[PDB]
Amino acid sequence: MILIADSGSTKTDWCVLNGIKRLGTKGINPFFQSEEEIQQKLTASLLPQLPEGKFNAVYFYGAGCTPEKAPVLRRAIADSLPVIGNIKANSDMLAAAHGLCGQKAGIACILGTGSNSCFYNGKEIVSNISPLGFILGDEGSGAVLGKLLVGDILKNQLPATLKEEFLKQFDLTPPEIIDRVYRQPFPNRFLASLSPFIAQHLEEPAIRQLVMNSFIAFFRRNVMQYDYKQYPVHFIGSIAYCYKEILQDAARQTGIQIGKILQSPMEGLIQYHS
Amino acid sequence: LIADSGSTKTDWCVVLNGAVIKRLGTKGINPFFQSEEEIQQKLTAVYFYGAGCTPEKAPVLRRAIADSLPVIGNIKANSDMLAAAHGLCGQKAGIACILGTGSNSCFYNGKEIVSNISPLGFILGDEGSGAVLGKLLVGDILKNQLPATLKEEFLKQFDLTPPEIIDRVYRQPFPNRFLASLSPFIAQHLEEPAIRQLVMNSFIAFFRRNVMQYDYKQYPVHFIGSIAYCYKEILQDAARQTGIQIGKILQSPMEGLIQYHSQLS
Amino acid sequence: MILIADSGSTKTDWCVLNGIKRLGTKGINPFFQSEEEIQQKLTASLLPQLPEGKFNAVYFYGAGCTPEKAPVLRRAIADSLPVIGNIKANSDMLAAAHGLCGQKAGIACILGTGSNSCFYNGKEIVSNISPLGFILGDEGSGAVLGKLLVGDILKNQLPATLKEEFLKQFDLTPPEIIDRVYRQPFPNRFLASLSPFIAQHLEEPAIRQLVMNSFIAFFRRNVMQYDYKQYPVHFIGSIAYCYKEILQDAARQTGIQIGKILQSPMEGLIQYHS
Amino acid sequence: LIADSGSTKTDWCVVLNGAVIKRLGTKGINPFFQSEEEIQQKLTAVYFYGAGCTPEKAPVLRRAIADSLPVIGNIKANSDMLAAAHGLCGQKAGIACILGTGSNSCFYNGKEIVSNISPLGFILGDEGSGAVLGKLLVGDILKNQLPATLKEEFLKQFDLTPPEIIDRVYRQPFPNRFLASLSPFIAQHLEEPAIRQLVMNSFIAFFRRNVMQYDYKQYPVHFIGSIAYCYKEILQDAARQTGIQIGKILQSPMEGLIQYHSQLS
Amino acid sequence: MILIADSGSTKTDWCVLNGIKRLGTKGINPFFQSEEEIQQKLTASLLPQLPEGKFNAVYFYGAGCTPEKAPVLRRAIADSLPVIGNIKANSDMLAAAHGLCGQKAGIACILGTGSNSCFYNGKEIVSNISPLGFILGDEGSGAVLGKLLVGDILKNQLPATLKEEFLKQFDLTPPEIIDRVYRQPFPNRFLASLSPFIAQHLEEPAIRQLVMNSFIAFFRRNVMQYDYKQYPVHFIGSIAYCYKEILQDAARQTGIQIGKILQSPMEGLIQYHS
Amino acid sequence: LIADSGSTKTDWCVVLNGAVIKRLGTKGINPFFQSEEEIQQKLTAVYFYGAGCTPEKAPVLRRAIADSLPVIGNIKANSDMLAAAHGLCGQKAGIACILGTGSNSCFYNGKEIVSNISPLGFILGDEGSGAVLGKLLVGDILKNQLPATLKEEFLKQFDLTPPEIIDRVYRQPFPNRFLASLSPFIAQHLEEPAIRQLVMNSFIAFFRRNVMQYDYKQYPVHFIGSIAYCYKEILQDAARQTGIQIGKILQSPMEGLIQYHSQLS
């Protein structure tokens, strides 16, 4: 039996024997959390959720899990869980390239609170384009969507009757909104919390253009730097699925062949370590 | 006093009866960041127009300016937007705007600021500023949406590595005041049809989201700022396809600000 | 069914259907706590205490709940609880004016770790007198009582045989006592923790004068700024009830008509939202 | 070294053989707040009598004073209460007391401090100090227990808003050193029968809780401090209804402190 | 019935009626933790582990429990536990002198993450030698053992094939190891976490000399400052027991008579308060 | 440039064509501790060789040195170990080593550093340094492994109490730079057969754990540092029982460093 984790912003589902049960923990990131911390979260909110017995080898995929901060997780993951084999963890980005591309080779994009892209060559990401973040890049993410949204609403750049609703729907006030992007933690996550307002107002010819465009640019500024002219692109992540209809629409008008598009990669990510 | 500020350089000019007698220049003052007993320390080391010195944070300067400086008149500490509304509009109505490290616009009837748009900041809005230009410059260049050598010369110019540019906009202090020190790289490459279009669009946007709100079909929109002067050519060039009459566009607002208190001194 | 909360220093009782069960959480204050925090406390130490099912509309009364920091609670209270209607929260001070004055109009004073006073005009507090705090004001509170107490004991201003008992009863040492008022958090709460020593030594002709006086001044320096000459005053809060006999005594010799006096307002606070 | 301190102004006076040759004045030093390698930095930028320089924190100054200053004699760093016990009592017994930003009292037999009362602080005790006067002044005034215009003139004098006065005693640093900069408002309004009674009572209390403990029916109680001199009239006026003989009451203790080391120099 | 605690680094076992059950909490130290904290740990992770009913008098032995920080524990220990008698706590060092020397007099050394020594005179430690810490002193502890170990391994001062194993066994990398001793909390505890590597490689003629020596110096630099020439020495603590065979070996070649040596003192520490 | 650093004193020497024209001396610079806009502030208040200025932290100085200093040549900022490898080895191969507040060793082929041992730090390794000597000095003395009066004179010399020495190596900043300011107590007591053996062993160890690794049976090991010169006698005395040829042993590396850039200036 193997244990598999795919994590990041917000929660972190925890799904198998030889080909059994999922658990609902939180998101683990070693770029905000430390090691003398995650030994508690796994022992407190996970240990009583496990089916007991000795494990084999877990493969941790998730936020901040880099080839540089990887051991931060493996040094704690091992000091908390009952395993005899060994623990492995790869770039959160790889969690997609193994679940969307499995054993083959191709592009893989994770569009969540951040939009990142890779070139999976059947072995690993043979080249990456650091999205740069919800400010300089990340073009086409909840972060960048919440940003742009409030950016046009708190500026009367949209129907005056849509701002009154947005302001009351989130109960936020203009000053708080601004104080929540320049003076507080996880702005990328905050702005992103105002993402659904877009999927709830797609009738507005404007809001839809606020989503389409975002993805247009992402395609022409974040993925086109590969040999897409001869390869299919797959997707993963909230905003990616939630706007599936809208997303691929741009892919069409951008001479690129969109492929597999689903919220979580854990599906075929099970069929990778078995 | 009469002093104009802008986090970087604050030009002072003590008036006497018609013109400056002797001017100095102490680094930018800002209560939104600086401490009273730290400006009361700095200054010791009247009309005041500073950045981020809103009418709620005004009394922070008026105290530090008194303790350090000997003056028995009437102490005033207003915004940096009001300084432009005074120098660019004088006494007549106008659409005061500034394009510093952060763009801004307001409506000065002729006595005070009545209707002032709310530029969010270097992240949410500030379209058409000194920091936003960098936010777009250090972005497109670092996003391979530009030549291969232009990127090598760039980073070889500021001696900055990509993994440190990131550590300078999110992690370290002042991301907009950092994206401004990269702004110059633009004015020095207005040859490329791209880098120039990275400014035009960021200027068409400023209008299509700020000035175009006030009654512009009757009032003259006057600009001011270190980026407003540095990019004066493309400036009105942008006011070409938006349809609007651009007026007084001077770099420093101190000029017309002296013409405000030139009545009683 | 409505949910009602009255909170502040120390715990926070949580009591009804159409006119059902109380819960024992802790005190929530958005002037020391943040929003990305209270979503946990309500989900952790409250959720498993609820009777399940969808609620209607809760009315949060408590510490730091101001018309300025109010949404801090309503933005988290909503993101944690299972409600469909809407959440409401008013000044902790109002929690008294609605439970002691109900629908009528009159004065209302909360004497707890802090002494605050209002003028309820049947609609809301039509005028307030910021007590200023356990240092400049708050005259007549546990904070101000603990202060004054230790102030006279740690100065040999009281029976030398009463100081030895106080020092050992709290196991505190003079230096700790001083280090707990100038260099640590919630001094108003600490000094206030030494309040009971007064209700346990009321035989002492001195200690009682240490309580009476405190309330005398409060009446003549914190409430008399209203039209008390034609209105009845009610009370609420620990020190208010615990010293009920002593309190109203001053009210007598201060030409004012004391009225309803009870520890918590939740009683008739139920009969306000039903 | 000979130097007297008091967080605000520390008057220095290098002795030679009978009197001061040249004096200076560097801001107040206090290890209880300041860092050794920060006084060792400051000073570089012997008998020492400072505030909050208890015999446990004494070696903090003696090191910083040596590293910065060239002196091969005997380095001493004592309290600020001992400076008054020396200047006000000299060599003869006495009841040394100080009324700075924080009142204090002690008993100096004639060689050292034997019995020293423990003034708690500006919150717990310090009755009859420079900070407590403010603690009562910024309180009664802000508590409407005084005229309506007296409150308007007050806040119009220090340019402080009520919601900021709060943010200055609880939230921001040094609440007692802040309630002292408001102390002056009292000496400038001793006309009102109230403001004057806000001092008297705060002075009757000092005695009824500090000096009246030591054997006062035989020893002279000598005062000193910026508030002790500023309110000298009401001072002994309070020593009128308490029944006690008030002695040497000088503002600066440096005078009689030189008369202490005037033996060997 | 009395409650007894012996604590320090890592966990803290909690064992009796008149001469009943142990509990497994964590380590409480008032030199890193505060009082407005331990009231939670005892109420959260201990209260549901107790056999209920009113207690008599607990005797807290453990980290940071000094005659100066003692009340930090007794002020919280009392405000959390259901006791009517009184609480007592002595130097963690004394926890050994009462369990190894009981009522008699003699030396007592605690060799754990830190090596401390005392002279128990039947009444109390009549003289102490502050070990000074895992840097200037503590000679002969896990701290000092982990230190010395990594000190010779990360310097190729040992078999090159033993370093590759150490580095992979702890999954640590040289830079992390250094960043974990100069820039992070509880280094004494970290370095000490690499202690077992020594008890797992005692075959190496070198590693054993890395342990023997450590204890040799400890004897000749930390305990010999007493009248050992006429008194027996007892031990307590992890590294003390784990290397029992190796330890006393030095005692032999150091003209000193080693005596009782066992991991925890709680054994006879029960037979002290009964 | 040419400047050598070492957290304490950084000696500057502006070269012209063959020798120093005028030298200064500003406190030690170190990005590993100091902030760019804090060195850009400091300096304003080329070849650079500093402490803890690894090739990863090099661009931190090269920017601050440019903003503050006017220079249009080629800006370099290298380690402090490379400065010794250049001054002690010049152009010919050698075993560069330093014995400052932290010992170090490396192998300079004749163009750069190829094989550099990794001295851990003042706690893990650094055997044979300025801080480690204190780590052993403030330890054995405070461990009664030395005379009774030697301990009294010691603490009476630095005016430090045992319970504060602890608060200076674990709790307070810079434990190795603190254990260096105690280093001098050794050179002033090389009479005792013990204190001298506390250095020898700490020097035999340096060799038996650092230099003895490189091919020492053919290359000359050159030293440098404030502790390397202060203890020059015992130095080579230790190189007596370890069997190794000690070469250029100069206190400051600036001498031979000028002989490096004396080619083009």
Query: Which residue of chain E has the CA closest to F212?
Result: E157
**Angstrom resolution of this structure:** 3.2
Query: Which residue of chain A has the CA closest to C88?
Result: A171
How far away is chain A from the Cα of B101, in angstroms, using its nearest Cα? 15
The candidate with the shortest Cα–Cα distance to F60, out of F86, F82, F29, F81, is F29
Phi-psi region of B110 (alpha: psi -120 to 50; beta: other; left: phi over 0): left
A28: its two tokens? 């683990």
What number of other Cβ atoms are within 10 A of residue D23's Cβ?
A: 11
Best of E72, E75, E83, E86 to disrupt the C interface (most C CBs within 10 Å) is E75
| Cα separation, F126 vs F152, whole angstroms | 28
CB contact under 8 A, D125 and C181: no
Best of D56, D124, D202 to disrupt the C interface (most C CBs within 10 Å) is D124
CB contact under 8 A, E71 and C170: no
- Interface residues of chain C, partner chain E, Cβ below 8 Å: 170-173, 176
DSSP H/E element including D20: strand D20-26
The CA angle C167-C168-C169, to the nearest 5 degrees, is: 95
- Experiment used for this model: X-ray
| Cα separation, F235 vs C194, whole angstroms | 65
- A106-125 as b/e: b if 16+ CB within 10 A: bbbbbbbbbbbbbbbeeeeb
Measured in whole angstroms, how far is the alpha carbon of residue C104 from the centre of its chain?
A: 22
Q: Which chains does chain A touch, 3 or more C-beta pairs < 8 A?
A: B, C, E
| Cα separation, E272 vs E96, whole angstroms | 11
Which residues from chain C sit within 8 angstroms of residue D33, using beta carbons? none
| Cα separation, D241 vs B240, whole angstroms | 85
Distances (CA, A) of D200 to A245, B143, D138, E108, F136: 81, 73, 16, 62, 61
B95: its two tokens? 């659409």
Which residues from chain F sit within 8 angstroms of residue E116, using beta carbons? none
CA C136, C141, C143, C144 dihedral sign is positive
Best of B116, B117, B120, B178 to disrupt the A interface (most A CBs within 10 Å) is B120
Which residues are within 8 A (CB) of E214 and not within 5 positions of it... i.e. 6 or more apart? Answer: E139, E140, E144, E145, E148
How deeply is C2 buried, as exposed, middle or buried, from its count of CB atoms within 10 A (0-12, 13-18, 19+)? middle
How far away is chain D from the Cα of C267, in angstroms, using its nearest Cα? 32
What number of other Cβ atoms are within 10 A of residue F161's Cβ?
A: 12
CB contact under 8 A, D160 and B59: yes
- Interface residues of chain A, partner chain B, Cβ below 8 Å: 129-130, 132-133, 135-137, 147, 150-151, 154-157, 174, 177-178, 181-182, 187, 221-222, 225
Query: Which residue of chain E has the CA closest to F32?
Result: E183
| Cα separation, D107 vs D85, whole angstroms | 8
What length does chain B have? Answer: 265
The candidate with the shortest Cα–Cα distance to F104, out of F221, F17, F19, F197, is F221
The candidate with the shortest Cα–Cα distance to E129, out of E265, E60, E221, E14, is E221
Q: Which chains does chain E touch, 3 or more C-beta pairs < 8 A?
A: A, C, F
DSSP H/E element including A241: helix A238-242
Which residues from chain A sit within 8 angstroms of residue B145, using beta carbons? 221
The candidate with the shortest Cα–Cα distance to B6, out of B52, B39, B44, B42, is B52
How far away is chain B from the Cα of A193, in angstroms, using its nearest Cα? 15
CB contact under 8 A, C176 and E74: no
What number of other Cβ atoms are within 10 A of residue C25's Cβ?
A: 17
> How many CA atoms does the CB half-sphere of E101 hold within 13 Å?
27
Neighbouring-strand partners of residue F3: F12, F48
| Cα separation, A235 vs A224, whole angstroms | 15
Domains of chain B: 1-80 (3.30.420.40), 82-126+216-265 (3.30.420.40), 127-215 (1.10.720.160)
Are the beta carbons of E196 and E207 closer than 8 angstroms? no
Round to the nearest angstrom and report the end-to-end CA distance of chain B.
9
DSSP F94: B
Residue listed under structure tokens 């661009």: F59
Phi, psi of E121 (to 5 degrees): -105, 35
| Cα separation, D139 vs E241, whole angstroms | 64
How far away is chain A from the Cα of B85, in angstroms, using its nearest Cα? 21
D26: its two tokens? 């560097």
The CA angle D211-D212-D213, to the nearest 5 degrees, is: 85
F16: its two tokens? 């012209």
Q: Which chains does chain F touch, 3 or more C-beta pairs < 8 A?
A: B, D, E
Are the beta carbons of F133 and F235 closer than 8 angstroms? no
What number of other Cβ atoms are within 10 A of residue B82's Cβ?
A: 22
Are the beta carbons of E46 and E14 closer than 8 angstroms? yes
Chains E and A touch (3+ CB pairs under 8 A): yes
Phi-psi region of E64 (alpha: psi -120 to 50; beta: other; left: phi over 0): left
Strand ordering across the sheet containing F3-4: F20-26, F10-15, F3-4, F47-49, F76-78
Neighbouring-strand partners of residue E90: E61
- Interface residues of chain D, partner chain C, Cβ below 8 Å: 117-118, 120-121, 123-125, 135, 138-140, 142-145, 162, 165-166, 169-170, 175, 209, 213
Which residues from chain A sit within 8 angstroms of residue C80, using beta carbons? none
| Cα separation, A171 vs A191, whole angstroms | 14
